[PDB]
Ligand binder design. Structure first.
Ligand SMILES: [Mg+2]
Ligand SMILES: [Mg+2]
Lengths: 162, 162
DNA sequence: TTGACTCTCTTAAGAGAGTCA
DNA sequence: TTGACTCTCTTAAGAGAGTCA
């Protein structure tokens, strides 16, 4: 809403409803050939999602709260960071999944950063494979790997140099 | 074009006009504290761009050729890969800048892979900092680093556990 | 046959707000 | 008030295609 007290109330209510989302254990790559275990608080696949939660897209949800007869709305993963600066270096802060599990709402698996930083965690070698992220990754990153390139730098003639 | 011989003549002509683009020397991070040198063949900022070259967006260009009275057109950076498969693992092949310089049309700084592999290259540690791409990176990757996270994992209660 | 413009679209990470009941 | 839906937009990596002289 408006005050710091009102936000803390919004964050506390969010944490409590999310605290009751089913908890799925996931074993993930940490990098360096190591394995770790995370506990995700996953919002349901269908309705009902939990007091104050509604689905706005296939893997998009919003958290609603009517404070002083006036309704407020947030992206479902944003609420933990409501008292944090909303932009960084002129870029919008974004809810980043250290676990890369979209349905998950566990704030211990979420960080607040630029979309670029958010995206980049997808290719990181992970907490045990070289991760240099100030706010450390919880796991490797689904996209990390050799890649599957169809063709590298070619050339027919002799006009270019590296 | 249309026959493999005609696609080759189109690749040859594109190389020749791109070959005459201003060759800009860039000193870049390779990772592991190293500095390397990349030579970029940059398409002009405004018109004219070079025979067969037209701009369709801020940083988007196309190459055009009329073969047997029929006009043919391709994305600026796609021409080198015209005789290679256009998809991989059910994913479209895209022009990936190993130099991360969009205006550059030097084909020795380009690969043909999925949008994900393409994007992922922005965060790599570089050819001397740990790069594991089968088709190796020429530089570190503009986005690599500790990041700038505003807020990491947080909770106010005890509803959660990593 | 060409050049220089015009346009909308794709992907995945993410967001905003409106309609009913 | 609270729930369950509906819709389009943002951002960078990238695309195809139309007009006109
Ligand atoms: Mg993410
Ligand atoms: Mg690229």
């Amino acid at each position: 809403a408006l005050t710091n007290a009102q936000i803390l109330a919004v964050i506390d209510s969010w944490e409590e409803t999310v605290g009751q989302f089913p908890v799925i254990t996931h074993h993930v790559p940490l990098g360096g050939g190591l394995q770790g275990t995370l506990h995700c608080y996953e919002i349901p696949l269908a309705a009902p999602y939990g007091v104050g939660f509604a689905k706005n897209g296939p893997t998009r949800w919003q958290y609603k709260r009517t404070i002083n007869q006036v309704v407020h709305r947030w992206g479902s993963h944003t609420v933990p960071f409501l008292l944090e600066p909303d932009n960084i270096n002129g870029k919008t802060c974004t809810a980043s999944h250290l676990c890369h599990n979209t349905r998950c709402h566990n704030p211990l698996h979420l960080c607040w950063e630029s979309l670029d930083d958010n995206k980049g965690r997808n290719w990181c070698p992970g907490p045990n494979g070289g991760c240099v992220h100030a706010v450390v990754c919880l796991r490797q990153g689904p996209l990390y790997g050799p890649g599957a390139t169809v063709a590298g730098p070619q050339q027919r003639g002799s006009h270019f140099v590296v």
